Amino acid sequence: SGGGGVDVGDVVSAIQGAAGPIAAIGGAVLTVMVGIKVYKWVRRAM
Amino acid sequence: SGGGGVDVGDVVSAIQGAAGPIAAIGGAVLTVMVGIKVYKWVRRAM
Amino acid sequence: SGGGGVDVGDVVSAIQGAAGPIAAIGGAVLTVMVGIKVYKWVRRAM
Amino acid sequence: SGGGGVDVGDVVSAIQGAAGPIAAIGGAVLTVMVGIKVYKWVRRAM
Amino acid sequence: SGGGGVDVGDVVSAIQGAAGPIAAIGGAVLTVMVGIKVYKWVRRAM
Amino acid sequence: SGGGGVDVGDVVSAIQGAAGPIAAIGGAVLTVMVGIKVYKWVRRAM
Amino acid sequence: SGGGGVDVGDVVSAIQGAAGPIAAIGGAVLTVMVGIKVYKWVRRAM
Amino acid sequence: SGGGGVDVGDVVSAIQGAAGPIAAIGGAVLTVMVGIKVYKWVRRAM
Amino acid sequence: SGGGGVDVGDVVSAIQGAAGPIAAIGGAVLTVMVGIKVYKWVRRAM
Amino acid sequence: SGGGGVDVGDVVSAIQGAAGPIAAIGGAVLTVMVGIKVYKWVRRAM
Amino acid sequence: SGGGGVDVGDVVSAIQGAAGPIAAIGGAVLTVMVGIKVYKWVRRAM
Amino acid sequence: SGGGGVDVGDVVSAIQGAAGPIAAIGGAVLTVMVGIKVYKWVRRAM
Amino acid sequence: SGGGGVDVGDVVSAIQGAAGPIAAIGGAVLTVMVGIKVYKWVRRAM
Amino acid sequence: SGGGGVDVGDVVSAIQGAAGPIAAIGGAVLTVMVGIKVYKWVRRAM
Amino acid sequence: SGGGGVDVGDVVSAIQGAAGPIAAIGGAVLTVMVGIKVYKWVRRAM
Amino acid sequence: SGGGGVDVGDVVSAIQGAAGPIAAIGGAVLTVMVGIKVYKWVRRAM
Amino acid sequence: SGGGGVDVGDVVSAIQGAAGPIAAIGGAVLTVMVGIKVYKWVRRAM
Amino acid sequence: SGGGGVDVGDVVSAIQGAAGPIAAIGGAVLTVMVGIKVYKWVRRAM
Amino acid sequence: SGGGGVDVGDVVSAIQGAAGPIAAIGGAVLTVMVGIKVYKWVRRAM
Amino acid sequence: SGGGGVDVGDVVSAIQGAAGPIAAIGGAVLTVMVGIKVYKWVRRAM
Amino acid sequence: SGGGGVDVGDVVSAIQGAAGPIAAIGGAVLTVMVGIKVYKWVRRAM
Amino acid sequence: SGGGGVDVGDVVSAIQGAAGPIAAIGGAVLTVMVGIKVYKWVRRAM
Amino acid sequence: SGGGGVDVGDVVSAIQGAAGPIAAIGGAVLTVMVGIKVYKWVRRAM
Amino acid sequence: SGGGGVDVGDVVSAIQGAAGPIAAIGGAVLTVMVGIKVYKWVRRAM
Amino acid sequence: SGGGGVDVGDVVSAIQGAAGPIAAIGGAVLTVMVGIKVYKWVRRAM
Amino acid sequence: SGGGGVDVGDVVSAIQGAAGPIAAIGGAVLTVMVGIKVYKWVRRAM
Amino acid sequence: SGGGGVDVGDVVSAIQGAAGPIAAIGGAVLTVMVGIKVYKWVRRAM
Amino acid sequence: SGGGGVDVGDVVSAIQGAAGPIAAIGGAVLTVMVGIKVYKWVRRAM
Amino acid sequence: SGGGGVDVGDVVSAIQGAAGPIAAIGGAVLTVMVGIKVYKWVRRAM
Amino acid sequence: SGGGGVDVGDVVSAIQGAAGPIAAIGGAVLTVMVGIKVYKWVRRAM
Amino acid sequence: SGGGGVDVGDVVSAIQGAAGPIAAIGGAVLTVMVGIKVYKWVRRAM
Amino acid sequence: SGGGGVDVGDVVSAIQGAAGPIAAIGGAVLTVMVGIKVYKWVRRAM
Amino acid sequence: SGGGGVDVGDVVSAIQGAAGPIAAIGGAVLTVMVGIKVYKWVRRAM
Amino acid sequence: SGGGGVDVGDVVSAIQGAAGPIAAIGGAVLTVMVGIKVYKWVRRAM
Amino acid sequence: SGGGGVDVGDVVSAIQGAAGPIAAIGGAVLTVMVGIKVYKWVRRAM
């Protein structure tokens, strides 16, 4: 009950929760990466 | 009967039962982990 | 909270932020690239 | 700051800057190309 | 500096410079072309 | 130097030079053309 | 049942679902890209 | 018989069975991923 | 929802939106290009 | 004879025999695991 | 905003603007070309 | 400014300027052409 | 359906539609071009 | 069967199907492009 | 709408409009050309 | 025999078999992709 | 002799032998994987 | 002498000797394991 | 069928059809041109 | 066999087949184009 | 031998073999493409 | 000696040897791939 | 001395020595792996 | 003194001393192990 | 052999062959054109 | 040797060899094209 | 020494060496490609 | 000292040293790869 | 130093050096091309 | 040396050499063209 | 040799040869033209 | 400090430094490439 | 406190700190890589 | 109470507490690791 | 004091100290590994 259920419950919320901000880096990384290539496609179509 | 059968029975239900929440962390960990890579595949396909 | 939320937050701002200047190279690269072809279209229309 | 902002800044100035002389070839190429055709239009109007 | 500025500089001088003789063909071509028609206008005015 | 200057130089001499004989046809054509009309003016003045 | 079936089900809907907007960028990117070249083909056909 | 055969049997059905939905995420992930690149190939062929 | 839908939405508006000015260069490039050839057709029809 | 030979004989058949189903989980686990990655290689080759 | 709108704006003004002088060559070329033929029509009407 | 305005400016002055002497041939050609026909009109009016 | 059918539909109407005015320049260009030559044929037939 | 055969089947119909409208842009683009040149050939033949 | 319709509209008015003065040269050229031949017909009819 | 030979056999047939439909997407993708460029080559040859 | 030599011998033949079919999945997986990319290279070369 | 030296001697030869075939499983296991990954690297390099 | 056959069919009828009126200008141009020369032949035969 | 041979076969018949009507535009375009010049040669020979 | 030599052998024959029909599309595409331009060269030479 | 030297020796010959046919697919793949583009370059040069 | 020093010495020479052939597989594996990709880069550069 | 101090002293020197060669196997094992993976990283980077 | 030699052979016969009728228009055009001028020379010689 | 030297050798002979017939179309195309213009020059010289 | 230096040495000679014939295809491809366009430039200059 | 410092030192020199020849393959691979594309750019510029 | 500086140095001299003869084809191509048109201008001026 | 220098050398001799006969058509075309006009000038001077 | 020399040779003989009959029209045209004026000179000298 | 800072520092200077000569190939490649096209533009303007 | 907090603190500063120079290689690598392609885009736009 | 409850309590706070800084290294390690790859993705998108 | 404190102290200095050279292999391994890929990125950007 205590250790098993409750603590493991904390594992779920804390782990995937703290991982949310990790996915946030994903969004920010995407802003830049597609950014440099919009530059790449422009130069294609100069 | 008592100590052997009953107590060991408790071992089964309590141990694999408390382990259920452990598997729950597994699900939560999965939400995040695949999350950061959906970010990785996007940047591939920028 | 600390490591997850805050640090990942830094990942977002620092990564896509530092990527901004990367996009800047994109603009500068564009100035030159279209430049050499305005030269190409002139010679077409000599 | 350093790597991202400063270095990328260098990318802009160095890349589109070095490209300037590339556009210079454009001007020089134009002197010749229109030159051979002023010859072409003269022969039209012999 | 080196590759960009200097080499591109060479592009300008070498390209439009080598094109000068191309324009020379223009002058020589003109000597002949108007030549055959001075023949054409004479025959008009026989 | 080689391709540009020398070869183009050849263009000039070869083109306007070979055109010289073209102008020669002009002289020969003139002998005949004025010839038929000296015939035309005689018949005017019969 | 729970973790396997249900959670994985969420993976499908959440992942390919969130990816829909990613494809939306595709449409928007297309508006611009073909746009710059309609400009390129016009200049061909000036 | 009981623990070995039966329980292990459960391992097979439960594990690869619960994994089925995991493969489902695979299908859903595929819908999105190829989606963003149909966008990439269009922009190639603008 | 957040990262997927909202951020990707931003991708669409920001990317094809910033591309609008790219198409603007298209219009401006067209003014010049057709300009030099109106010059070319005049000289045809001298 | 009895305890040593016979009982130990039972150990062999019962232990490695009950272990057979354990290997069965191995097969079932394999169905799923390779399954999720056929998904991974598809997304590589999107 | 910055890179997209502003820089592309510069593309328009700089490109079609620098092209203006290109059209100027058009006017100057026209002065000469019609010039040599006013000579051609005079000789027609000798 | 430099390449566009200045160089194109050179195009105008150099092209229509060098064309001036081309028009000079026009004047010289006219001296001869009308010359041969003053001969033609005399013979009319013998 | 949405992205493919609808957006591409927009491509058709927007692209060939915006191209209509491009053809309009064609008509206007024609007014002028034939105009300068009606001048050319008159001078033929002076 | 399910994921492989059925889902991939959807890939075929959805992808090449959604691509149909892409080809539609092709037809519309063609209406305009040939349009501007019918204008180009007219001006040739003024 | 903007780039396509409006800008192309400008193409029409600006191009055929600027061409009007080109036709003006046509009128002026005609004054002279017929002028020199009224001289030619007089000398016929001396 | 069982797990090794038979199950692995299933791996072969199921994996490369389910992959067949994946190749089917390849054919369908090809119909569209070449489709948009037949449009590209037409506009070249307008 | 018995347990050591003979049984271990069985380990070799049974383990690497049962692994053969595992390599078979390798061949089958290869048929599909290269299959989807022959599709990828075609679309490159559309 | 007897029990100590001789019997222990037997321990050495019998134990590490019977272990030889154990190492044989090692070789056989290696044939398979590297086998499945030659399959993995091929699919990388498809 | 649709895009290829039908649309191209439209190309034929629309293009050579719209060209009919172009030929109409031909007739009208002819009325004037022969007109000015009936004037030229009269003055010959005054 | 299926995807390769059959589908590619479809590529041939569908592509060059749909291109037939494209050539049809060629015939129709020819009717008009030669049409406007029969007008041009008449005015030569007024 | 089996997997390596034989299967890879199949790769060669199946891949470049199925590619043959791909080249067939090449021939068919060529029939059309040169077709539309025989139309282009005719209109040049109207 | 046995397991180490001999077996590993087999690894070398068997692995890079079986890989030879893999390279064979490379040759066959090349026949097709360059094949489809000889088609691409022809259509360029139609 | 005996067991410790001598036997352990044997461990060193026998273990890293037998491992040499393991590295040999490394060389052979490399021949093949780079082989299949020289095929991959050729097809890039077809 | 004798048994305790002296003999135990021997334990230290003999035990950790004889263990030195054991660590020697460690070095030799390391030569091989990193060896096989330098092979693994090469194949990554093929 | 097939695609290259045979198909290209078809190109020759089909292209220059279909061009024969194009030359036929040449003959027919000649009948008319010289026709209108036999009219022109008659009126000269009224 | 085999794949590299021999196969590439085949590339040379097969590619430039199959291209020979492509050049044949060139000759045939030339027969027609000059044909239609011998018609054009005749009508000049009617 | 052996594996590293010698084998890698083989990589250099074998890889860039086998690539030589690849460049040979380049020469052969060039014979054909320029061949078809000498045909293209002739038809320009018919 | 011995095992740690000395042996690890050997790791550095032996590993990055043997890797030098690996980089040598890099140079040789580069000779070929750029080689095939100098062929690609020539055919562009045929 | 070695691979980078020296080998790349070879790239420069070998690539632009081998390209010299490519420019030589340019000169030779020019001899012919202008040749066929000196023929074209003669026929203009017959 | 080989591919670059030698092959390109062949380009020069083969291309401008094969072009010689092209110039031959020029001479032959000239015989006819001036021929039809000697007919034109005779009829002038009837 | 073949295409260049032989085919161009055919150009010469076929073109100037077929032009012979064109000159024949010249003779026939002359019979008539001088014919109508022998009528003109008679009426002068009535 | 040592490994991190110093060695990585070496990475920067050695990598981008050795890359300098790579850019040198860029300059040399440019000399040739523009060279072959100055040949292409000359033949345009023959 | 000591081992946990302090030492781990050192881990953070030392690890990500020493990694800074690793990112420095990133900047230097970028200088070169974009460098070789500015060369690639120039040759595109030659 | 004392030893069990209190001391174990200390185990929890001290162990997971001292582990906090261990996770701190995780954050710092992440700063660097993603750092070197932002460098990797830039070079992809150069 | 002696055994605990002093000896364990030796453990720290000796273990992490001897590990320093282990990290040295890390630096050396890095020189090579990035080396082979600078080769990989060059071939990308050939």
From Swiss-Prot, chains A, B, C, D, E, F, G, H, I, J, K, L, M, N, O, P, Q, R, S, T, U, V, W, X, Y, Z, AA, AB, AC, AD, AE, AF, AG, AH, AI:
Residue spans crossing the bilayer: 22-39
Membrane topology of this protein: Single-pass membrane protein
GO cellular component: helical viral capsid; host cell membrane; membrane
Predominant subcellular localization, coarse grouping: virion
Periplasmic-facing ranges: 10-21
Keyword list, A-Z: Acetylation, Capsid protein, Helical capsid protein, Host membrane, Membrane, Transmembrane, Transmembrane helix, Virion
Localization annotation: Virion; Host membrane
Topology, Cytoplasmic side: 40-46
Keyword Transmembrane helix: yes
Family the UniProt entry places it in: Belongs to the inovirus capsid protein family.
Quaternary structure (record): Homomultimerizes. There are several thousands of this protein in the phage capsid.
Biological role: Self assembles to form a helical capsid wrapping up the viral genomic DNA. The capsid displays a filamentous structure with a length of 760-1950 nm and a width of 6-8 nm. The virion assembly and budding take place at the host inner membrane.
Record's protein name: Capsid protein G8P
Species of the source: Xanthomonas phage Xf (Bacteriophage Xf)
Gene designation per UniProt: VIII
